[PDB]
Amino acid sequence: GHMHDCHQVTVSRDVTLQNKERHDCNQVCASIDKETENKLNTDIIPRLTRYMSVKGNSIIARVQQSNSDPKCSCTWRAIIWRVYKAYDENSLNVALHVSHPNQQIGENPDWSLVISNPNVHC
């Protein structure tokens, strides 16, 4: 019944883009694929580095859809392989919106974070 000291995190970006034009939402969302990567590497990973046992994440991937809705729901997911279990899902989510302390202007409202697998080693 071995015990797990790290957990695996899926960090997600969730953006709604205007599509008054009624184009493919894969193509509308693709517009800010590069933005999302640059945001992942320059802000999101850095501010979660503190919590990882070992540096290590998957390449951020967009979720394919099949629609042309007036508002496009765009979602990217990346996986961070090992984060100390000591840091709960809530504290990791907070780390996304707040850095400097007592802060009131939240950042990255578009970003969220789950535990993808409770049972990882470091």
Residue numbers in the entry: 1 to 122
The article reads:
The Dothideomycete Leptosphaeria maculans, causal agent of oilseed rape stem canker or blackleg disease, is one of the fungal pathogens in which suppression of ETI by the presence of an AVR gene has been demonstrated. Surprisingly, despite low sequence similarity, AvrLm5-9 and AvrLm3 are structural analogues of AvrLm4-7, sharing an anti-parallel β-sheet covered by α-helices. Structure-informed sequence database searches identified a larger number of putative structural analogues among L. maculans effector candidates, including the AVR effector AvrLmS-Lep2, all produced during the early stages of oilseed rape infection, as well as among effector candidates from other phytopathogenic fungi. These structural analogues are named LARS (for Leptosphaeria AviRulence and Suppressing) effectors.
The structure of AvrLm5-9 was solved using iodine single wavelength anomalous diffusion (SAD) signal from a derivative crystal and then refined at 2.14 Å resolution using native data. The structure of AvrLm5-9 consists of a central β-sheet made of three anti-parallel β-strands. The connection between the β1 and β2 strands is a curved α-helix and the connection between the β3 and β4 strands contains a shorter helix surrounded by two irregular peptide loops. AvrLm5-9 has three disulfide bridges, which are C3-C119, C22-C69 and C26-C71, named SS1, SS2 and SS3, respectively, according to protein numeration without the signal peptide or C22-C138, C41-C88 and C45-C90 according to protein numeration with the signal peptide. The mutation leading to virulence towards Rlm9 is situated in the middle of the long helix, and the mutation having no effect on the interaction with Rlm9 and Rlm5 is in a loop connecting β1 and β2. Neither mutation is expected to perturb the 3D structure.
